[PDB]
C-alpha cells in the first residue's frame, strides 16, 4: 500500500488516466453495480453483511457530527464555515472510521482506503461538492471490494443501503452548510452535485410497469414512488431545492424526460458519465492514485 496521489496535471494525462488500471477497475465497478440493481426497488430483499452494517454506522457517525456542528453566523453568503469544523473531524478520524469496517488482518490497507473517504465529502477550502467527490466515494467502495472486505453478495447493498445512505448525508451537508456546486452548474450540468444515482436509479426502473422517463417531471408520480427509486429521490431533492419551471432550473434532465424508455436513459447516462465526469479534466483532475487504484497501464 502507498499514499494515493494526484496524477492528472496536463492534457496528455487524461489519456494516461483512461489507459490506467484504476480507470478499468473503476468503470468496471460502476457497470457491475448497475447490472446488479436492474429492475429492483430499494426495498428488494438483499443480503446485509457485517461490513455493510459497519459502513452504515460509519455514515451515521458522519451524520451525528453534522448535528454536533451547527452552522455559524457569518458574513459570507456562500458556504458556511462550520463545514470546515465538520471536515476537520472527518480528516482526523477517517482511519479510525475505516478501521471499524476493515478487519484487523487487513489493517495495512486502512490508510490508503481512508484517503478516498477523505476525498468523498467535499472541499474544506472552497466549501464545495461535486461529482469528483461522489467518484471518490465510489472509489472508496471499489477499494473495499478489491481487498475482499465487500463481496459479490454485497453488491446490491452497496447501492441500496450504503450509497443510498451516503446520498442522504451528502444532501444534509449540502443544505446545512450551504455548500456550492464544485463544477459546472445550472444549464451546464446534469445535476449540481450528483451523477451516479441517476445511472443506478435509471437501471432500477428498466422494465417498470407504469413509470416511464416523462413521469420524473410529474410531481405526483415522484411523490408516490420516490421511496423505492433512487432516481426519483434525486428529482425530489431538486424540486425541493429549486423553484420555477423544471425546464428552466434543470434543462438537461428536462430533455432526458423525453427519452422513451429507462433502458435508453441508462445507456445514455453511462455515455454522458464518461464524457462529462470521467473525461472532464476540471471534474476528475483531483482523482488520487495509489496501489489499489493505480495509474499504471491496465493489465491485459
Residues within the annotated binding site for ATP? 126, 131-132, 282, 285-286
- List, in order, residues 6 or more apart from 116 with CB less than 8 Å away: 4, 136, 137, 139, 140, 143, 288
Looking at 1.20.120.1150, 1.20.910.10, 1.10.20.140, 1.10.10.60, the CATH number of the domain 190-300 comes to: 1.20.120.1150
- Look up residue 197 and give its three cell numbers: 444515482
Residues within the annotated binding site for Mg(2+)? 186, 192
Cα gap 78→81, rounded to integer Å: 9
Method used to obtain the model: X-ray
Counting Cβ atoms within 10 Å, is residue 251 exposed (0-12), middle (13-18) or buried (19+)?
A: middle
- List, in order, residues 6 or more apart from 195 with CB less than 8 Å away: 131, 134, 269, 273, 276, 277
Q: Assign 3-class secondary structure to the chain.
A: CCCCEECCCCCHHHHHHHCEHHHHHHHHHHHHHHHHCCCCCCCCCCCCCHHHHHHHHHHHHHHHHHHCCCCCCCCCCCCCCHHHHHHHHHHHHHHHHHHHHCCHHHHHHHHHHHHHHHCCCCECCCCEECHHHHHHHHHHHHHHHHCCCCCHHHHHHHHHHHHHHHHHHHHHHHHHCCCEECCCCHHHCCCCCCCHHHHHHHHHCCCCCCCCHHHHHCHHHHHHHHHHCHHHHHHHHHHHHCCCCHHHHCHHHHHHCCCCCHHHHHHHHHHHHHHHHHCCHHHHCCCEECCCCCCCECCC
Instruction: From 37, 3, 88, select the one nearest 196 (Cα to Cα).
Output: 37
Provide the CA 73 distance to its chain's centre, in angstroms.
Answer: 29
Rg (CA), the chain: 19
Residues within the annotated binding site? 126, 131-132, 186, 192, 282, 285-286
CB 44 within 8 A of CB 38: no
β partners of residue 180: 128
Domain boundaries of the chain, sorted by first residue = 1-189, 190-300
| Number of other residues whose CB lies within 10 A of the CB of residue 216 | 30
Amino acid at each position: 500500500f502507498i499514499i494515493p496521489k494526484k496524477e492528472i496535471h496536463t492534457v496528455p494525462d487524461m489519456g494516461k488516466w483512461k489507459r490506467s488500471q484504476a480507470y478499468a477497475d473503476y468503470i468496471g465497478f460502476i457497470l457491475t453495480l448497475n447490472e446488479g440493481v436492474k429492475g429492483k426497488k430499494l426495498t428488494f430483499e438483499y443480503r446485509v453483511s457485517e461490513a455493510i452494517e459497519k459502513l452504515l454506522a460509519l455514515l451515521n457517525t458522519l451524520d451525528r457530527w453534522i448535528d454536533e456542528t451547527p452552522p455559524v453566523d457569518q458574513p459570507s453568503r456562500f458556504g458556511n464555515k462550520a463545514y470546515r469544523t465538520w471536515y476537520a473531524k472527518l480528516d482526523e478520524e477517517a482511519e479510525n472510521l475505516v478501521a471499524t469496517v476493515v478487519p484487523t488482518h487487513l489493517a495495512a490497507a486502512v490508510p490508503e482506503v481512508a484517503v478516498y473517504l477523505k476525498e468523498s465529502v467535499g472541499n474544506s477550502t472552497r466549501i464545495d461538492y461535486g461529482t469528483g467527490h461522489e467518484a471518490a466515494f465510489a472509489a472508496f467502495l471499489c477499494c473495499l471490494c478489491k481487498i475482499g472486505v465487500l463481496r459479490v453478495d454485497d453488491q446490491i447493498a452497496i447501492v441500496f443501503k450504503v450509497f443510498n445512505r451516503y446520498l442522504e448525508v451528502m444532501r444534509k451537508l449540502q443544505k446545512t452548510y450551504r455548500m456550492e456546486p464544485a463544477g459546472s452548474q445550472g444549464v451546464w450540468g446534469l445535476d449540481d452535485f450528483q451523477f451516479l444515482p441517476f445511472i443506478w436509479g435509471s437501471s432500477q426502473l428498466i422494465d417498470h410497469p407504469y413509470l416511464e422517463p416523462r413521469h420524473f417531471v410529474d410531481e405526483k408520480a415522484v411523490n408516490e414512488n420516490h421511496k423505492d427509486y433512487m432516481f426519483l429521490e434525486c428529482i425530489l431533492f431538486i424540486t425541493e431545492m429549486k423553484t420555477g419551471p423544471f425546464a428552466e432550473h434543470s434543462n438537461q434532465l428536462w430533455n432526458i424526460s423525453a427519452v422513451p424508455s429507462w433502458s435508453k436513459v441508462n445507456q445514455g447516462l453511462i455515455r454522458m458519465y464518461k464524457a462529462e465526469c470521467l473525461e472532464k479534466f476540471p471534474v476528475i483532475q483531483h482523482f488520487k492514485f495509489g496501489s489499489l487504484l493505480p495509474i499504471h497501464p491496465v493489465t491485459s
